[PDB]
Amino acid sequence: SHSLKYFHTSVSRPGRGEPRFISVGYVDDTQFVRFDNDAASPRMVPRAPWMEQEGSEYWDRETRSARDTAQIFRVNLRTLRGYYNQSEAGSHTLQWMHGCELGPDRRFLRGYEQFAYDGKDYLTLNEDLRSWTAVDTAAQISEQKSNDASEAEHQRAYLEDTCVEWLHKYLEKGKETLLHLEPPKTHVTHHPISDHEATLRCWALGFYPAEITLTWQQDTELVETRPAGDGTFQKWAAVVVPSGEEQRYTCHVQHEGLPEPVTLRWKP
Amino acid sequence: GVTQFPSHSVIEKGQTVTLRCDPISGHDNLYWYRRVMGKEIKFLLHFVKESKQDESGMPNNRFLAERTGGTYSTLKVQPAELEDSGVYFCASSQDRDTQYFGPGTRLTVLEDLKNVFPPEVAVFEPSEAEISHTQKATLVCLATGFYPDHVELSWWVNGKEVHSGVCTDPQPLKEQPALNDSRYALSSRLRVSATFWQNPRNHFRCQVQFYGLSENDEWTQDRAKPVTQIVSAEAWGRAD
Amino acid sequence: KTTQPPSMDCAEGRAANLPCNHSTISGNEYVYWYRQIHSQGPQYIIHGLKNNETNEMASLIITEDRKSSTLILPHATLRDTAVYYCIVVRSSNTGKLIFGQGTTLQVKPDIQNPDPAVYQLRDSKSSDKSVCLFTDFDSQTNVSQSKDSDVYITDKCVLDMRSMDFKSNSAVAWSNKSDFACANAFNNSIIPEDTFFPS
């Protein structure tokens, strides 16, 4: 399975002029592009080494699309103010996420699309991709506008064809690394809390993709998965254990890059 | 429908014209398109509400467009040059997929207004031979000597406009094609039944609406100011 | 992008099939058709993506390969005489239209009563007069412009006497020079044999 996802953020800046707008693109768990109207070069630019070769042709189209979206989101922010009855003074946020997913067979599985206003769900494209549904009551006028203008058609065209088409193009361009599975390097650390209690921590380091399960065999702390910085991820699990017998507790690492699920022990 | 004003405009090189468009109310998008005589219709500008979404077709700095309250739009040429002559179409849309156009503003920028002339209008009575041969009577209207070609021709029977039996040339003819700013001629045909033409109680008028100068423009010449006007010629029915 | 034949003749009452090619088309580009009658505002007709579609104005046929289109006008009339533009528009936030050359569709009328003739018509006033009317010929006949610079000849236009169920073609010629008769007025066109010349 593979997915092409974009995340768009517009943030009004009443003090300035145009709202801040940022678009990021992802193939699976790997960023490959970005647009940021505040950057030195306010254009769609490569964010992975395998995107350097694309010519003026591709980046121009993507900059037009990003700048056009920015310019519509600016209009939207103004209009959304009028739907809620908020002041001109406050800053607000419009977010937009769209993505398509392929199945094991590498063909279209599902497409999704939704809008958020101030981090709250606003408007969602239905699963059949043929109509929009309001998730906020304030979104009813936008829901009807979108359904009346047959907007879903353009998005269905995007999610079922254009998104699918390009995802395959990207997957070929990023051949070397996108299909590469990086297994985690795993270990266990000891940290005494007291004379009666101590901490055991199961580490998963330098893996790709981000998907991973770390279980312990109820005082279990589990951090949100984090980026290492070189496209690989890190994650740790921690369990609180009575000081003495720690060997009744074992860590279990399920991840795609491993031949078989791995058990960790802590070597004192 | 989309509305546009003015329908016609003839102005001097160097002068200002504001073109206005009133979109189908409720439409978020408004577009301006133009056809520069000799070329295809081409995109100028797209407003999403009061904002400029796309400006790629806007000729240069002499052109400026606004849509203050996201309703009616205004397009201002200042200063106007000859190459700006043509038809300017406004359009509005709700889905961006279906665009509705107004009737357009026909613009002629002239280098010198001395060249503007009202039409002379003549009506040519039906042939005695056509009546006996076909039982029908064709009146021809001839509108001659007008510049620029801003004319609307219509036929009037007994004080009412007629549409059936009428044929008016799509384009006018140049009178002196070998000369600059040549004047034009345009013809029209009204065909009625012989016995309708043979009734002396029947009145036939050819009407030509000419679009020329307004009352604001300077006129220092001898001949009557070539203002926007209606020129007619008429003929009464004839038993013989 | 998009190619259409520059002109198309068509009989009234029958269906018109206007072709359009767009072999570079991609999966998110939409096929639109507009038309313009004379110099009045262009007019939306229909649009489609991949399958056929129908409205009250027209139908659209798009091939499985998507490389070509057909506009079908169900029962063509004289009102349907226009330039017809086939425009491909890629999904965008503006949907800007690029008008090509389009197909100039002439809906030729029936002409049930041919009676080709050249009449002289005189002014309702004085002096000038002298206008020649070539009328009642079939849509086979082509009226050429004059070779003489000082003789004015109009294109042929069509007459719709609706209440009569009658249509007719006509062309007007004039010149106001001395030796200009209605007998030589249309010497530059192939006029049908037995064209009626009144004495």
């Binding site: 699309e113 506008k145 | - | 936030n93």
Partner: peptide
């Protein structure tokens, strides 16, 4: 590529 069209809310 990113979606070439968005909604005018």
């Amino acid at each position: 590529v990113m979606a070439p069209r968005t909604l005018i809310l």
